Amino acid sequence: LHKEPATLIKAIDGDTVKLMYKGQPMTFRLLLVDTPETKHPKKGVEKYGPEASAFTKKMVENAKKLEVEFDKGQRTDKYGRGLAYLYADGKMVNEALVRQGLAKVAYVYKPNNTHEQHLRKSEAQAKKEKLNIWS
């Protein structure tokens, strides 16, 4: 896998960000994580939804450099969203969310599963520390 530069347009919620990528606006969905949502198609605003949104927003807005890393499988979902791991100054946003107990590790679909073991270990740590969602 390889990291490529991107520029922030707007954080949309905990799991979704709009970026300029290779000169075009594109919505990205963060691979492998499920955050509580503020949008939710059926539920609207869920517990820790605002917190997870604010966490992603701060991280992306305060970064010097953002980079996206695609996995080995499909790079877009059925909604036209890019599927990627997002890095803010070298720190993976996907991991930071899970480590803080603000996201769970999603149902995984091979072959988009390269960082799965890494994220699962962070989730186990957040669960052990009783953080946020695990409180």
> Which CATH number goes with the domain that contains 87?
2.40.50.90
Per the annotation, does 13 bind a ligand? no
Single-letter code of the amino acid located at 48: Y
Q: How far apart, in whole angstroms, are the C-alpha atoms of residue 133 and residue 46?
A: 11
Catalytic residue among 29, 95, 99, 123: 29
Instruction: Give the resolution to one decimal, in Å.
Output: 1.8
Structural domain of 54:
1-135
Q: How many domains does the chain have?
A: 1
CA-to-CA distance for 106 and 66, rounded, in angstroms? 23
| Long-range Cβ contacts of 111-118 (<8 Å, 24+ apart) | 111/71, 111/72, 111/73, 112/31, 112/32, 112/71, 112/72, 112/73, 112/74, 112/83, 113/32, 113/71, 114/1, 114/71, 114/72, 115/31, 115/32, 115/71, 115/85, 116/32
Contact 5, 67 (CB under 8 A): yes
Helix ranges, the chain (H): 49-61, 93-99, 116-128
Strand 66-70 and strand 82-88: the pairing is antiparallel
**E-only strand ranges, 14-81:** 16-21, 24-30, 33-34, 66-70
37 classed as catalytic: yes
Per annotation, catalytic residue among 51, 67, 81, 95: 81
Alpha-carbon distance of 101 to 94, in angstroms, equals 11
Q: Residue 7, annotated ligand binder?
A: no
- Phi first, then psi: what are they for 29, rounded to 5°? -105, 130
B/e letters for 79-100, b = 16+ CB within 10 Å, e = fewer, are: eebbbbbbbbeeebbbbbbbbb
Phi and psi torsions of 67, nearest 5°: -140, 150
Nearest by Cα to 81 from 3, 1, 15, 9:
15
Active site annotation includes 81: yes
CB atoms within 10 A of CB 116: 16
CB of 85 closer than 8 Å to CB of 33: no
* DSSP summary character for residue 134: G
CB 83 within 8 A of CB 94: no
Residue 77 counted as an annotated binding residue: no
How far, in Å, CA of 86 to CA of 94, rounded? 7
